[PDB]
Design a protein around this ligand. Sequence first.
Ligand SMILES: CCC[NH2+]Cc1ccc(-c2ccccc2)c(Cl)c1
Length: 326
Amino acid sequence: GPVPSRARVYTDVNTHRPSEYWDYESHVVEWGNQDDYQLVRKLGRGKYSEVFEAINITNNEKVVVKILKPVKKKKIKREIKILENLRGGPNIITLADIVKDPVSRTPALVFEHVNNTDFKQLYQTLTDYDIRFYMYEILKALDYCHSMGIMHRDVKPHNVMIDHEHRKLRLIDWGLAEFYHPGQEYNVRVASRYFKGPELLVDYQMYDYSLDMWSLGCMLASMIFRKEPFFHGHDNYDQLVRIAKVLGTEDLYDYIDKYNIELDPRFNDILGRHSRKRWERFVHSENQHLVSPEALDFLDKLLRYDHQSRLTAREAMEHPYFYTVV
Ligand SMILES: CCC[NH2+]Cc1ccc(-c2ccccc2)c(Cl)c1
């Protein structure tokens, strides 16, 4: 069968804590009064969630209300428990209240408001420095949640809110987040296609916090090379092929040999043979002002097939790419 794996950092944080911390199924959720909140406007729509800008009428303060289509109670409980556990962590979205509609009884999560700047105007004005600055703010959030025994599992630009004027960053949407337990086999149907780590695409279930480090490398590559998304797969199988077109098929076979992974037969006719590409080949006139040897060394240490060989969030924060920050 497949070779077992465990995280290189924060491996046993949940093992040494009481069940109350990680047993989200047994957590008691207490709903506030939705009458304290007046919905202003629709901010977005997810699979089972509608996000609104709201007013807390009791203090005239702006909040964000995430109304969830209750399709799975267990999932809702998991998200609430994780949000409560992480509350007050650096750059983590703050859950302020948990409420139900007196009538429809739909669950709704109330969060601190984030004045997210339009990224379409932001992407062109961001400098080498701004990318280093915001990448470090995301690392703060990830080192924190991993130290708390949680993996986000949905790291992507749509889950990162930036108030550029106040240089404020928040990692949101903890709906796919999970407690890390060493040796546990997780569902690979997590993260958004372009940000899915090779472990997920080869169906290697014993993954850890390092999944988030792959996803972060994908956002970093798209930002520094101005190529969105960086790995543009059309399905989950093709997504591995797009990765192999960059990292090469040689290191891919080394990774699946190391963990005795059985490669799905659907990869037989699409994978082909690809050489390992130098990161310098993605440098062009449109992006050379954001690229540096430090950035390429940093990216090379995140985008690795072997989830164990990737930098942890703490090792990443210590990289020379961040010397000019904070
Ligand atoms: C509602 C869409 C929110 N998205 C905002 C956003 C999120 C992340 C980034 C970012 C990605 C990589 C490195 C540095 C920053 C940016 Cl530029 C913009």
